[PDB]
Design a protein around this ligand. Structure first.
Ligand SMILES: COC(=O)c1ccc(COC(=O)N[C@H]2C=CCC[C@@H]2C(=O)N(C)C)cc1
Ligand SMILES: COC(=O)c1ccc(COC(=O)N[C@H]2C=CCC[C@@H]2C(=O)N(C)C)cc1
Lengths: 163, 163
């Protein structure tokens, strides 16, 4: 029950470019990294959770305000969104929609993540759409993973790559 | 090394509805299933594979024709797309882009998938956009998981759910 499988920002850059419509983007990974916005070495933790429980867990909705810290420890901004438990057994799956608000703009994240896989130290991916500032008119992916698995409340390792 | 965690079509219908802008869809899971286009109990397997190998694996492209079968083995159509190996270790990650062609119309799948996690028998999720016929104007998710691992050629359980 321990199986890390991270992505690096270069890999994320190629994913971002391929999906943006730069079909030969794997030819030069460096060139793809260079043309992307990159947020590496982020952690997020919750500052507010509003939980709306349901018997047995399926349909439990969490409104959350998560805080982004950079590698030093500076607050870059918040991720405000909704989690919905789609399923509990044998894996917990949540739907996630979040708007991330930084000083230089905003981007949305949408996805469907296997929370049990994350407890196995695995990485999940959400789809990022730019919404305001330098992120506007760009798109890519966001990685999540449990930062320290013997922490409570849990902290998340986060990368964001758009182009 | 065997940790399954699948998504039922009802859980996928909720996700599709939330992703689509019907924000109360967890209220009545059955009612989200009802406004959704559902393709389930079908499998795919590789018919054509054209790999262009990159030393070290990162950048290996795969051009693929997959064939869809229903639960009684009948061919329903093809999924034609492209994969790129983003990373190999510790987990092999791949970007994917496919156009599925069925009798009742077409849909495009895009996503980044952990191929190692798939060998642990875990489900991966692609985003899906309707392109024609009953799928047109609709979005949602695709799940994949190996059905039987040391079957050859290897087969993947598929669910697609849009609205
Ligand atoms: C019933 O409640 C629970 O058992 C439970 C389970 C898991 C979690 C963790 O997930 C969250 O709440 N939300 C944030 C953190 C992780 C995923 C992404 C998400 C986030 O910041 N994004 C999308 C940027 C919270 C609660
Ligand atoms: C070095 O790596 C390889 O050579 C290699 C590894 C894995 C695979 C299997 O993946 C595929 O070909 N494609 C299909 C199967 C899996 C994901 C879904 C995908 C599919 O049908 N979709 C998205 C409709 C093929 C080649």
């Amino acid at each position: 029950i321990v199986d890390p499988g991270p992505l690096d920002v270069t890999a994320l850059a190629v994913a971002a470019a391929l999906a943006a419509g730069l079909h030969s983007a794997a030819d030069d990974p460096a060139a793809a990294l260079d043309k992307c916005i990159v947020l590496d070495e982020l952690t997020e933790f919750a500052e507010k959770l509003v939980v709306h429980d349901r018997p047995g867990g399926i349909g439990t909705t969490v409104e959350y305000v998560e805080v982004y810290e950079d590698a030093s420890g500076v607050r870059l901004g918040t991720a405000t969104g909704n989690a919905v438990v789609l399923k509990m057994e044998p894996h917990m799956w949540q739907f996630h929609q979040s708007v991330s608000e930084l000083a230089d703009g905003s981007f949305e994240a949408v996805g469907v993540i296997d929370c049990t896989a994350m407890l196995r130290r695995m990485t999940q991916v959400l789809r990022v759409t730019g919404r305001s500032g330098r992120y506007a008119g760009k798109s890519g992916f966001m990685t999540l993973a449990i930062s320290d698995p013997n922490q409570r409340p849990p902290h998340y390792s986060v990368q964001v790559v758009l182009c």
